[PDB]
Write a protein that binds this DNA or RNA. Structure first.
Ligand SMILES: [Zn+2]
Lengths: 200, 50, 52, 86, 121, 83, 120
RNA sequence: CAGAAGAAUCAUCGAAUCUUUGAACGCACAUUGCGCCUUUGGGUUCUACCAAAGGCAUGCCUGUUUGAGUGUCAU
RNA sequence: GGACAUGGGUUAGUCGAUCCUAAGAGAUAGGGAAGCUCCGUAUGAAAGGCACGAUUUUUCGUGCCUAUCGAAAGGG
RNA sequence: UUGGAUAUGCCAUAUAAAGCGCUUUCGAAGAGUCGAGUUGUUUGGGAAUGCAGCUCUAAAUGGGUGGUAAAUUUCAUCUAA
RNA sequence: UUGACCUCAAAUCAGGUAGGACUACGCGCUGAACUUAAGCAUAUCAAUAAGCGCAGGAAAAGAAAAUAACCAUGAUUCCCUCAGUAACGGCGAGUGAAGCGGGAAAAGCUCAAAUUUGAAAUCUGGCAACAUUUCUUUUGUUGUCCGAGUUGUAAUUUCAA
């Protein structure tokens, strides 16, 4: 198949071919809207390995997110507190721009379920992402045993609750000692609970 | 004032109907614990504030 | 309209920019006489339709 | 009530021109003539053509808006669209 | 008092005359109440009101059952005639499509199902 | 620092009746209700105003539909007429 | 054949706008006329001023629905009492109910009509 | 109290009604304000006026239809 | 007795509101924002019309050119 | 009203499918992602514990991890995006 | 010139879906100060309150890029223990886990990367037939057209292989 060639070619994105394609695609994506529907995936094998099937009920949206760190929305850059909280500029959003791209697209298409997403381009102002979406009301989705799970009501706004791949990455879900903060509220609540047994 | 909205006259009409004494046969009922209207209003004393 | 400007400025952009050899090789296409004869061969071996 | 504006009732309401009937029915001139052949629909001139043209004087063929309203619910028009698809 | 079972075994037009006659009777009774009426008339006011309600119920049920008969075995039917359990229940996967499985899983369940076993002492 | 003789110029409403919550909290010039946030789609609500929430929360009104739904749940959401 | 543009503007072309042809009606049963004459006319008024208007002005005074207008009151009176009014005046009372003064024609006697209604 | 006579201010509850609103959806709204579409009906009154019923929000998805492009070609 | 009780009482084609626009509010196009929401009001929008024709390959051709709300003292 | 069995009735093209066993064999395995630096913010994580921003950007017995940073050489373990 | 295709639009087009409320418990984001340190700036309070977004009857987590250094264990969750311990801290005030072990409960799996290539074997919808029902309210089946799909839908495979 050609998907193997597409994958190993995408690894080489500092080649002259990819640099030229990055230039022209970034130009035309800026000329479109910030969120615009993609007729087909620009990386069909990247979408394919992330869960996109080429049948009715699957949707692709392209979204550009402004890069950089976070700017404190305090007026005039004033914090009114101890000096350990006076930072205004070099602060960082704890969710990735890929999470931000997913959640803005999820609000744009409230009738769809955000399956997953992938990076497609970037420049000095934007990182461009394509979001794979699934229509839960479509019968082609409702009758497919490999994708029914997203029709269930417990998967409404996976990206908003942090259940997408990048969402689990952003909140530190992982196995082993390196995390150990894991679910943060769950782990923090587990110890800070003072278990007072009946007999003590 | 004389210039009223229809909404105001409705609220004023209901306020007038609620600003009445209680029927006398209510006071004779079995298990009755209501004697006088506790929600009565006078036009100088308490304002409707609409 | 914006989509028409997108079409034409993309055409202009591909002309202006330095296209890499691996992409510019698709700008050299088959000739008309060779094209009609190869398509004549292909129409003899079209796959069967769903009805057939 | 407030002042009613002229050309809103009477001849200017019950009469319709050929071009506005085309736009009302969303039909071409040939297709509109076709249903007018099939059904009984012919021009009907107002007694006051100037008033029924909302003050204009240009020569105009007039149909009853009732006739054109009736043609809105004609199944043959949908059959014309079906043949165009075919 | 008007009884619902003989109300149901009549025609819609006949019930239309009964409904209009009852409305006129209620209007006459209300005029009697404002001109000075006895407790018998004032009791007939509530009786007439309930009889009107019973008739209107019978018309509506006849209309709805007729709509149900007309839309029987139709893919799309009026919303008010559809089910109304909850919004979530209407949005859930049906038992048919909850139980849909791949041929890979069908083969696994066909050849290696959960067996009924027991252990000797 | 002027009391009497200054309350006599007060004859201009700043709030009127709200169409959503029915309270005299609809700022005319803002075109916003100070109570419920109308015309916003969400309802004005704040966790510091716990008493404010319980003054208007679910159950303070009729709950006519929620009562019907609860009765229908107890018997299993069945439809039709009993035989 | 290249199309000549004489406007320097591109204006969105006009496309066919099909009318709605639903696969099902959203309502199974159409509602009955929500405001019919029995709901339009609530009661007549028999107060002393109401009697005075009846016996001199040839005018009947009715408690009517809030949603009833002058046209609907005239049609309701015509259909309920077979007398055509020549004039109708309406006011919302301070108690929130609407009251209609119905001036009958010289052809009709308001005293007689009040007698048939029964409240006289 | 009056009052009548499968009763009942009874219980249950699977059929219905559910005004004006409200996420609130034709546009509004300190204005029972201002519109448009389709059908039907009314009467001393009929090219007029009126009434009734059913409709007209936004985003997105599948499909249909109608399109636009010095976008890619074939011819 | 403006108090308490019981009833009664406000009738519009022409008087106002409604209509118009003012300062100003405020959608839409878009762009921001983790978001609540912010900015923006003909703007980087495909933002709608009107007329002619023996009926045109009975698959339409040929022409021509801005919301809304906001005044019971403004306009009418 | 439901449940799992049971009695048979009918429909079912195994022309199929499947487990197991040996291969002198072959075995595709997810990239602006891993990793590195840096700046914030976090952690009990201390020569950065996780997350995020920016810069640089892999690989093919390769890549992680073995709680003191570095180069080097072994060993376990596991197989991310 | 007609056509094919791509891209982008329109419709009160056919059929759907989203908001709001609730929020005790779930997942996130954002985010203080009073307080303590007998002052106070790192720290503490606290990864808390307030704010914002999104769920469910539970949520989240989950079948190891996990531990261990053993004669080795074996998804996740919770309890007890580890343990006020290793460690972090103007090493001050303070803060502070994990492996093991015992228990509660246990359940495993699905794709991407493969040429079906002697046969797109796949699926939405329109129509018409039947059938079915917690249900005239529900859920399907078969046929036939139109489409979707080769810029890849089924079958086969998931490293334990
Ligand atoms: Zn309010």
């Amino acid at each position: 198949g050609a998907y193997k060639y597409l994958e190993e070619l995408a690894k080489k994105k500092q080649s002259d071919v990819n640099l030229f394609l990055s230039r022209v695609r970034a130009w035309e994506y800026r000329q479109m809207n910030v969120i615009h529907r993609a007729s087909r995936p620009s990386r069909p094998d990247k979408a394919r390995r992330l869960g996109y099937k080429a049948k009715q009920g699957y949707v692709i949206y392209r979204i550009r997110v402004r890069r950089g760190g976070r700017k404190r929305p305090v007026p005039k850059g004033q914090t009114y507190g101890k000096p350990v909280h006076q930072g205004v500029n070099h602060l960082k959003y704890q969710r990735s721009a890929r999470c931000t791209a997913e959640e803005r697209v999820g609000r744009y298409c409230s009738n769809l379920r955000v399956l997953n997403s992938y990076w497609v381009n970037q420049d000095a102002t934007y990182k461009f992402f394509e979001v794979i979406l699934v229509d839960p009301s479509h019968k082609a989705i409702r009758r497919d045993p490999r994708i029914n799970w997203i029709v269930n009501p417990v998967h409404k706004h996976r990206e908003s609750r942090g259940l997408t791949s990048i969402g689990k990455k952003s909140r530190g879900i992982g196995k082993g000692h390196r995390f150990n903060n894991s679910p943060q509220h769950a782990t923090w609540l587990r110890h800070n609970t003072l278990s007072l047994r009946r007999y003590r | 004032p004389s210039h009223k909205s229809f909404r105001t006259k409705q609220k004023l009409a209901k306020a007038a109907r609620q600003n009445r004494p209680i029927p006398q046969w209510i006071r004779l009922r079995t298990g009755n614990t209501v004697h006088y209207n506790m929600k009565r209003r006078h036009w100088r004393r308490t304002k409707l504030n609409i | 309209p914006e989509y028409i400007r997108l079409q034409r400025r993309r055409k202009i952009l591909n002309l202006r920019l330095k296209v890499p050899p691996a992409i510019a090789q698709f700008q050299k296409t088959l000739d008309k006489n060779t094209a009609t004869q190869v398509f004549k061969l292909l129409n003899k071996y079209r796959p069967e339709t769903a009805a057939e | 009530a407030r002042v009613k504006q002229k050309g809103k009732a009477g001849a200017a309401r019950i009469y319709i021109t050929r071009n506005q009937a085309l736009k009302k029915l969303q039909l071409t001139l040939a297709d509109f003539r076709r249903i007018c052949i099939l059904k009984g629909v012919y021009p009907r001139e107002p007694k006051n053509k100037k008033k029924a043209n909302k003050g204009s004087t240009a020569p105009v063929t007039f149909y009853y808006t009732k006739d054109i309203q009736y043609l809105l619910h004609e199944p043959i028009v949908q059959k014309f669209r079906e043949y165009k698809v075919f | 008092a008007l009884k619902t079972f003989e109300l149901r075994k009549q025609s819609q037009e006949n019930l239309a005359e009964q409904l209009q006659e009852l409305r006129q009777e209620l209007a006459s009774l209300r005029v009697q109440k404002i001109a000075g009426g006895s407790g018998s008339k004032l009791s007939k006011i509530k009786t007439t009101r309930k009889d009107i309600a019973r008739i209107l119920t019978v018309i509506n049920e006849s209309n709805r059952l007729a709509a149900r008969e007309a839309y029987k075995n139709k893919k799309y039917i009026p919303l008010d005639l559809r089910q109304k359990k909850t919004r979530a229940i209407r949005r859930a996967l049906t038992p048919y499509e909850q139980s849909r499985k791949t041929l890979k899983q069908i083969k696994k369940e066909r050849y290696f199902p959960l067996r009924k076993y027991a252990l000797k002492a | 620092t002027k009391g009497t003789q200054s309350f006599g110029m007060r004859h201009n409403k700043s709030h009127t009746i709200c169409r959503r919550c029915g309270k005299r909290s609809f700022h005319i010039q803002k075109s916003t209700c100070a109570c419920c946030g109308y015309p916003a789609a969400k309802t004005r609500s704040y966790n510091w105003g716990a008493k404010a929430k319980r003054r208007r929360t679910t159950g303070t009104g009729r709950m006519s539909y929620l009562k019907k739904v609860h009765r229908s749940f107890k018997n299993g959401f069945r439809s039709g007429k009993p035989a | 054949a290249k199309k000549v543009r004489t406007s320097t503007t591109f204006r969105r072309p006009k496309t066919l706008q099909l009318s709605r042809k639903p696969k099902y009606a959203r309502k199974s049963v159409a509602h009955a006329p929500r405001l019919d004459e029995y709901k339009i006319i609530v009661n007549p008024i028999n107060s002393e001023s109401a009697m005075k208007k009846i016996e001199d002005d040839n005018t009947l005074v009715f408690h009517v629905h809030l949603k009833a207008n002058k046209f609907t009151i005239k049609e309701a009176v015509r259909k309920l009492y077979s007398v055509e009014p020549v004039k109708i005046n309406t006011l919302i009372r301070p108690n929130g109910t609407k009251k209609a003064f119905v001036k009958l024609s010289a052809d009709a006697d308001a005293l007689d009509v009040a007698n048939r209604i029964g409240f006289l």
